[PDB]
Predict the 3D structure of the following.
Amino acid sequence: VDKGSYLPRPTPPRPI
Amino acid sequence: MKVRASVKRICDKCKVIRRHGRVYVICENPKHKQRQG
Amino acid sequence: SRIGRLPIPVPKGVSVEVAPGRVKVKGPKGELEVPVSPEMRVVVEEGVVRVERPSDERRHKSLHGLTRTLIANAVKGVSEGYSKELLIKGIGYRARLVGRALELTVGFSHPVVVEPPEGITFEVPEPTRVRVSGIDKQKVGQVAANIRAIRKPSAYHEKGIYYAGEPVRLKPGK
Amino acid sequence: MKGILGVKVGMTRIFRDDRAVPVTVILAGPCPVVQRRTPEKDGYTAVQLGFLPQNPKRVNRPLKGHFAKAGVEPVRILREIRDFNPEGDTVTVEIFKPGERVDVTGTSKGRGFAGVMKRWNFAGGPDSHGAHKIHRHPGSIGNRKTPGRVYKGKKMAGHYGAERVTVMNLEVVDVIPEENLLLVKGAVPGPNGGLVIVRETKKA
Amino acid sequence: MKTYVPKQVEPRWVLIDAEGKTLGRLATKIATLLRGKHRPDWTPNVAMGDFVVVVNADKIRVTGKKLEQKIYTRYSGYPGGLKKIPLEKMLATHPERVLEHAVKGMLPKGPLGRRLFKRLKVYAGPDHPHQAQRPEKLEV
RNA sequence: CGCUGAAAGCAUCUAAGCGGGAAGCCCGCCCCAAGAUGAGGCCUCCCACGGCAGCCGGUAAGGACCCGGGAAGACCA
RNA sequence: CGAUGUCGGCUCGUCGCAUCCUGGGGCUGAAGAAGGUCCCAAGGGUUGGGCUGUUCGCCCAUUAAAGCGGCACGCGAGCUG
Ligand SMILES: [Mg+2]
Ligand SMILES: [Mg+2]
Ligand SMILES: [Mg+2]
Ligand SMILES: [Mg+2]
Ligand SMILES: [Mg+2]
Ligand SMILES: [Mg+2]
Ligand SMILES: [Mg+2]
Ligand SMILES: [Mg+2]
Ligand SMILES: [Mg+2]
Ligand SMILES: [Mg+2]
Ligand SMILES: [Mg+2]
Ligand SMILES: [Mg+2]
Ligand SMILES: [Mg+2]
Ligand SMILES: [Mg+2]
Ligand SMILES: [Mg+2]
Ligand SMILES: [Mg+2]
Ligand SMILES: [Mg+2]
Ligand SMILES: [Mg+2]
Ligand SMILES: [Mg+2]
Ligand SMILES: [Mg+2]
Ligand SMILES: [Mg+2]
Ligand SMILES: [Mg+2]
Ligand SMILES: [Mg+2]
Ligand SMILES: [Mg+2]
Ligand SMILES: [Mg+2]
Ligand SMILES: [Mg+2]
Ligand SMILES: [Mg+2]
Ligand SMILES: [Mg+2]
Ligand SMILES: [Mg+2]
Ligand SMILES: [Mg+2]
Ligand SMILES: [Mg+2]
Ligand SMILES: [Mg+2]
Ligand SMILES: [Mg+2]
Ligand SMILES: [Mg+2]
Ligand SMILES: [Mg+2]
Ligand SMILES: [Mg+2]
Ligand SMILES: [Mg+2]
Ligand SMILES: [Mg+2]
Ligand SMILES: [Mg+2]
Ligand SMILES: [Mg+2]
Ligand SMILES: [Mg+2]
Ligand SMILES: [Mg+2]
Ligand SMILES: [Mg+2]
Ligand SMILES: [Mg+2]
Ligand SMILES: [Mg+2]
Ligand SMILES: [Mg+2]
Ligand SMILES: [Mg+2]
Ligand SMILES: [Mg+2]
Ligand SMILES: [Mg+2]
Ligand SMILES: [Mg+2]
Ligand SMILES: [Mg+2]
Ligand SMILES: [Mg+2]
Ligand SMILES: [Mg+2]
Ligand SMILES: [Mg+2]
Ligand SMILES: [Mg+2]
Ligand SMILES: [Mg+2]
Ligand SMILES: [Mg+2]
Ligand SMILES: [Mg+2]
Ligand SMILES: [Mg+2]
Ligand SMILES: [Mg+2]
Ligand SMILES: [Mg+2]
Ligand SMILES: [Mg+2]
Ligand SMILES: [Mg+2]
Ligand SMILES: [Mg+2]
Ligand SMILES: [Mg+2]
Ligand SMILES: [Mg+2]
Ligand SMILES: [Mg+2]
Ligand SMILES: [Mg+2]
Ligand SMILES: [Mg+2]
Ligand SMILES: [Mg+2]
Ligand SMILES: [Mg+2]
Ligand SMILES: [Mg+2]
Ligand SMILES: [Mg+2]
Ligand SMILES: [Mg+2]
Ligand SMILES: [Zn+2]
């Protein structure tokens, strides 16, 4: 059942 | 068999019996046969 | 109003010997062991067995009656014996004796054969009448019930195996 | 509860009543009894059978003594059959007649480290529509925090085969005593050349 | 003055006829004997109780409806792997387990309690193989 | 669903006792399994070796190493 | 909130039982066959397709049946997107 998404779609980690 | 929390006599021919920890009702009329549950 | 206190006539010549927790009962037709509560006293009088109870608590009153009857039945069994008659009803329906065994033709695609257990005797006087006989009342009534169960009375037709003296109660169809 | 040891030799089919009959041929006889197990001595009943003759040069001393006590020439394999006490000192294919039904035990062919699709007939992943390096992978192995672990017994990749397998209720198609041959209809575990046990069947 | 500590003692073997005794009320006593708490030099960190032989375990007794309703339980670790076996059946199959299981639960958990339990020797039926030990019969 | 049967003179499958009764339960089938430390059993083999429930050394029955391989196998086994 | 990735699908299960089927049963306004209704039962089973991102639902063709729920609306360090 569709509800609010609570995170944005994640991107792979930017290099540290 | 009727199974229900309220078991009662239905006709005067109806007999309340306790049998193996349970309340049944027996009648010569099969419709009236009940066990409590 | 009371069974336990009522005494048991013991005919000549059946014997009754009491042991702690049993009474043995012998007669012309054989013997029977009656297991009996340690708590009742079974008392042997002239031509009379009686049972007495230790108090008037419900359990004792309950064991009392049971006990008299249990012995009284044993007594009758070794003297007169016990029997039950079964009638067969319905067109195809028949009984015949195959040696010591009871063969039943009652509408199945096969006949049903009942072997007598020890102490039980089967007799077919006519072919729609069966007689179960023995000295043990429970055993008799039981084997009787077994045979009847092979084909209970139908609810719509005088058809099936019946106890003698069992009323035919049918209901309508359409 | 008769039984015998044998080697699987291979399959063919025979023609019987205008029918092709798939068969496995087993060399079974002759099996010298080399110890009897009894209730008084051993606590249960069975026969230790031997099979295939061995080079005495290869039989160490504790083994030789065992054979000696039976007056039995040395043999490559010893295996018991349970609840079987034959009259003779020797068991041969003759204990079976065509038409009887048997169970055969073999050691199955060994597949080594096997994937989930070969081992457990798992479905695998898609081959396109975006499947990323998961074409033969098992999928999920669990739930989340409850229960937070994997069931004992969960089907996973691992070794598969080279195990004891018993195929049951096989028809005996022929027996050829002059060559110690038992022809059983169907398939028997293991490779050609592998050891098998042929027992009377427990099916009815 | 420091409290007395016993040097190692020779343990005493004891024999108990379980027949007709009430399972639980026998088990507590067996436990005491195994801990060694009948002994005035009781020391809690050494095994210094008796070895206990019990016979006729199959003839243990139980009150109420427990033969039918008391359920022993075993978990295998596998899905659906909780086996429930009732007293009746346990007596009919491994009768000595009934006493064994009851005494075990009345011993301490830990390395010592486990060791104490090995000192219990329970037999169904009137005989036992510990003749060499000449176990002293105890009424309890 | 019964048999027998009181309390409760009748009746009652129940209070004593006995029966029938499910693809379900226990056994039975197939596989693992004595690290089952509660470490089971049987058959066979070796032997009561030297120097000083311990150590050092040479052996026994046996085992490993190495090698040729294997419908066994990732190495290992 | 110095991060417990969020629908659906796939994969892989596992459990509950208020049972969809299969087994046992009582009552039936149960003649039979077929139903209804309640009780016991969770061992196993519980199909393929059109539409739509759908879950759901409707529909086609079958079926003994085409069960309902829980497992972070089970499962993105397993995939999809
Ligand atoms: Mg990042
Ligand atoms: Mg009402
Ligand atoms: Mg009224
Ligand atoms: Mg009545
Ligand atoms: Mg007299
Ligand atoms: Mg008096
Ligand atoms: Mg043994
Ligand atoms: Mg093998
Ligand atoms: Mg391989
Ligand atoms: Mg795979
Ligand atoms: Mg496979
Ligand atoms: Mg495949
Ligand atoms: Mg697939
Ligand atoms: Mg594929
Ligand atoms: Mg796809
Ligand atoms: Mg991608
Ligand atoms: Mg790819
Ligand atoms: Mg998650
Ligand atoms: Mg957990
Ligand atoms: Mg392997
Ligand atoms: Mg032929
Ligand atoms: Mg091959
Ligand atoms: Mg004491
Ligand atoms: Mg303390
Ligand atoms: Mg045992
Ligand atoms: Mg404890
Ligand atoms: Mg603690
Ligand atoms: Mg009646
Ligand atoms: Mg009666
Ligand atoms: Mg009255
Ligand atoms: Mg009773
Ligand atoms: Mg019963
Ligand atoms: Mg019956
Ligand atoms: Mg079946
Ligand atoms: Mg094995
Ligand atoms: Mg071992
Ligand atoms: Mg083993
Ligand atoms: Mg343990
Ligand atoms: Mg061993
Ligand atoms: Mg090598
Ligand atoms: Mg190699
Ligand atoms: Mg947050
Ligand atoms: Mg953090
Ligand atoms: Mg973080
Ligand atoms: Mg996380
Ligand atoms: Mg589910
Ligand atoms: Mg239910
Ligand atoms: Mg049904
Ligand atoms: Mg009908
Ligand atoms: Mg109608
Ligand atoms: Mg009609
Ligand atoms: Mg119905
Ligand atoms: Mg009902
Ligand atoms: Mg189920
Ligand atoms: Mg299940
Ligand atoms: Mg289900
Ligand atoms: Mg299209
Ligand atoms: Mg679609
Ligand atoms: Mg849809
Ligand atoms: Mg919709
Ligand atoms: Mg149907
Ligand atoms: Mg569908
Ligand atoms: Mg989710
Ligand atoms: Mg919620
Ligand atoms: Mg779900
Ligand atoms: Mg998810
Ligand atoms: Mg992802
Ligand atoms: Mg997802
Ligand atoms: Mg995850
Ligand atoms: Mg993750
Ligand atoms: Mg993950
Ligand atoms: Mg994670
Ligand atoms: Mg994956
Ligand atoms: Mg998008
Ligand atoms: Zn009525």
In short: DSSP finds two helices and 13 strands in chain C.
